[PDB]
Design a protein around this motif. Structure first.
Motif, PDB file in Angstrom:
ATOM      1  N   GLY A 275       0.793  -1.224   0.000  1.00 44.99           N
ATOM      2  CA  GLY A 275       0.000   0.000   0.000  1.00 44.99           C
ATOM      3  C   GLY A 275       0.825   1.272   0.000  1.00 44.99           C
ATOM      4  O   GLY A 275       0.485   2.242  -0.680  1.00 44.99           O
ATOM      5  N   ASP A 276       1.923   1.288   0.769  1.00 49.43           N
ATOM      6  CA  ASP A 276       2.766   2.478   0.849  1.00 49.43           C
ATOM      7  C   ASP A 276       3.249   2.914  -0.527  1.00 49.43           C
ATOM      8  O   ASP A 276       3.408   4.114  -0.785  1.00 49.43           O
ATOM      9  N   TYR A 277       3.482   1.959  -1.428  1.00 47.45           N
ATOM     10  CA  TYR A 277       4.026   2.290  -2.743  1.00 47.45           C
ATOM     11  C   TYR A 277       3.037   3.096  -3.577  1.00 47.45           C
ATOM     12  O   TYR A 277       3.430   3.683  -4.594  1.00 47.45           O
ATOM     13  N   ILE A 278       1.757   3.098  -3.181  1.00 46.44           N
ATOM     14  CA  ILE A 278       0.679   3.730  -3.944  1.00 46.44           C
ATOM     15  C   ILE A 278       0.421   5.160  -3.471  1.00 46.44           C
ATOM     16  O   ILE A 278      -0.418   5.864  -4.045  1.00 46.44           O
ATOM     17  N   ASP A 279       1.146   5.623  -2.453  1.00 43.30           N
ATOM     18  CA  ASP A 279       0.985   6.975  -1.920  1.00 43.30           C
ATOM     19  C   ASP A 279       1.967   7.925  -2.601  1.00 43.30           C
ATOM     20  O   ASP A 279       3.191   7.779  -2.447  1.00 43.30           O
ATOM     21  N   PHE A 280       1.437   8.899  -3.347  1.00 43.12           N
ATOM     22  CA  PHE A 280       2.264   9.916  -3.998  1.00 43.12           C
ATOM     23  C   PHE A 280       2.145  11.283  -3.346  1.00 43.12           C
ATOM     24  O   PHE A 280       2.569  12.282  -3.925  1.00 43.12           O
ATOM     25  N   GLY A 281       1.647  11.326  -2.120  1.00 46.47           N
ATOM     26  CA  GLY A 281       1.778  12.494  -1.290  1.00 46.47           C
ATOM     27  C   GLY A 281       0.792  13.594  -1.615  1.00 46.47           C
ATOM     28  O   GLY A 281      -0.041  13.491  -2.517  1.00 46.47           O
ATOM     29  N   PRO A 282       0.894  14.693  -0.878  1.00 45.24           N
ATOM     30  CA  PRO A 282      -0.065  15.790  -1.044  1.00 45.24           C
ATOM     31  C   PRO A 282      -0.108  16.326  -2.466  1.00 45.24           C
ATOM     32  O   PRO A 282       0.913  16.468  -3.141  1.00 45.24           O
ATOM     33  N   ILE A 283      -1.314  16.687  -2.907  1.00 46.73           N
ATOM     34  CA  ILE A 283      -1.469  17.187  -4.270  1.00 46.73           C
ATOM     35  C   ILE A 283      -0.759  18.525  -4.442  1.00 46.73           C
ATOM     36  O   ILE A 283      -0.286  18.845  -5.539  1.00 46.73           O
ATOM     37  N   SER A 284      -0.669  19.309  -3.373  1.00 48.58           N
ATOM     38  CA  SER A 284       0.084  20.550  -3.309  1.00 48.58           C
ATOM     39  C   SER A 284       0.620  20.649  -1.895  1.00 48.58           C
ATOM     40  O   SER A 284       0.081  20.031  -0.978  1.00 48.58           O
ATOM     41  N   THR A 285       1.677  21.430  -1.712  1.00 46.21           N
ATOM     42  CA  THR A 285       2.311  21.480  -0.401  1.00 46.21           C
ATOM     43  C   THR A 285       1.302  21.842   0.689  1.00 46.21           C
ATOM     44  O   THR A 285       0.557  22.820   0.576  1.00 46.21           O
ATOM     45  N   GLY A 286       1.266  21.031   1.744  1.00 46.94           N
ATOM     46  CA  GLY A 286       0.409  21.281   2.874  1.00 46.94           C
ATOM     47  C   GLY A 286      -1.002  20.751   2.751  1.00 46.94           C
ATOM     48  O   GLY A 286      -1.752  20.803   3.736  1.00 46.94           O
ATOM     49  N   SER A 287      -1.384  20.224   1.592  1.00 44.32           N
ATOM     50  CA  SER A 287      -2.721  19.686   1.429  1.00 44.32           C
ATOM     51  C   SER A 287      -2.874  18.367   2.173  1.00 44.32           C
ATOM     52  O   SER A 287      -1.928  17.578   2.278  1.00 44.32           O
ATOM     53  N   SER A 288      -4.090  18.102   2.653  1.00 41.32           N
ATOM     54  CA  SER A 288      -4.421  16.789   3.203  1.00 41.32           C
ATOM     55  C   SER A 288      -5.051  15.854   2.179  1.00 41.32           C
ATOM     56  O   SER A 288      -5.526  14.778   2.557  1.00 41.32           O
TER      57      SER A 288
END
Length: 330
Positions: A275-288
């Motif tokens: 699952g971790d491999y599928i996380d590409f992080g916030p869409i913009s800095t600071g977004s949830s």
């Protein structure tokens, strides 16, 4: 002969991987994006429009005693993400991880699109799809692998991409210490110039495996895993609050979520993407809101087993007379 080179993520998300490549005499080392979905070796150069260079290392053919202009040859490429580049062509000596090809076509960029300029970490691409896709005109050129093949101990290369860590590209041999279990080989169609194969199905998390044929390409130059909309919907339905956002351009999910794994079939074998491999992080800095690593291929025209999938496996690109692909867990 053989070669072995370390490949390193360009950023904390594994958006791409760069591998050092020696070009010319004396060597000029450029960090190239090895791309099994294309077939041009092109570089930022002393010929690239100056306003389009922003921090990349450039190839300067006039400083290489082995460079020769390939008279009359030009190239122009457009990639699936809308980026592009074009220019002229030299032949020169190119080495990867100790494996040397003389007379390799090195495509010198005169122009690159903005996404290349804006990425200072990537000095060019080294294509590893079939040479039928090479864009040089009027005389199509061979890939680095095609030129090296006859000299290699075995006509293969392997991709062992890391998750948030360096990995390895090997040429000419299988490192039997680099994977667990056995390698499962599967048939390849070269009809579109890609390493195109058919997965035998998928599972989401701990769910049951769905047997279904999924034709797609093994593409180290694409970050994400692009699959049919039915499969992608089934995945994201298991993540509370995940949704497809037309404004963002794909599936997003709450950054507070824990993602399930995704399994794909290779023959009777199974490769598990954590699952971790599928996380590409916030869409913009600071977004949830976080960007998903599994996305629909519906707008592409082909399914793409990009880095998200490939980095879960040790992958053999077997360039024998009838090519095949191999996958092992690791």
């Amino acid at each position: 002969s053989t070669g072995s080179a370390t490949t390193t993520p360009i950023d904390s998300l594994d958006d791409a991987y760069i591998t050092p490549v020696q070009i010319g005499t004396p060597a000029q080392t450029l960090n190239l994006d090895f791309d099994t979905g294309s077939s041009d070796l092109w570089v930022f150069s002393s010929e690239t429009t100056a306003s389009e260079v922003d921090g990349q290392t450039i190839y300067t053919p006039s400083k290489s005693t082995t460079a020769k202009l390939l008279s009359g040859a030009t190239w122009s490429i457009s990639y699936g993400d809308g980026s592009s580049s074009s220019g002229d062509v030299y032949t020169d000596t190119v080495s990867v991880g100790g494996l040397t090809v003389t007379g390799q076509a090195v495509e010198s960029a005169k122009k690159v699109s903005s996404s290349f300029t804006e990425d200072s970490t990537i000095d060019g691409l080294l294509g590893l799809a079939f040479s039928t896709l090479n864009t040089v005109s009027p005389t199509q050129q061979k890939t680095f692998f095609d030129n090296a093949k006859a000299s290699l101990d075995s006509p293969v290369f392997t991709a062992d991409l890391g998750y948030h860590a360096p990995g390895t590209y090997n040429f000419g041999f299988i490192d039997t210490t680099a994977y667990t279990g056995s390698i499962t080989y599967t048939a390849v169609s070269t009809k579109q110039g890609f390493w195109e194969w058919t997965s035998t199905g998928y599972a989401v998390g701990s769910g049951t495996f769905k047997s279904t044929s999924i034709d797609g390409i093994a593409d180290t130059g694409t970050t994400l895993l692009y699959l049919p909309a039915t499969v992608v919907s089934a995945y994201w339905a298991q993540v509370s609050g995940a949704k497809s956002s037309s404004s963002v351009g794909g599936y997003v999910f709450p950054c507070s979520a824990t993602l399930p794994s995704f399994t794909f079939g290779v023959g009777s074998a199974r490769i598990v993407i954590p699952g971790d491999y599928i996380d590409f992080g916030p869409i913009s800095t600071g977004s949830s809101s976080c960007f998903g690593g599994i996305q629909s291929s519906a707008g592409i025209g082909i399914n793409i087993f990009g880095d998200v999938a490939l980095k879960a496996a040790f992958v053999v690109f077997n360039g024998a007379t009838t090519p095949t692909l191999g996958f092992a867990s690791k």
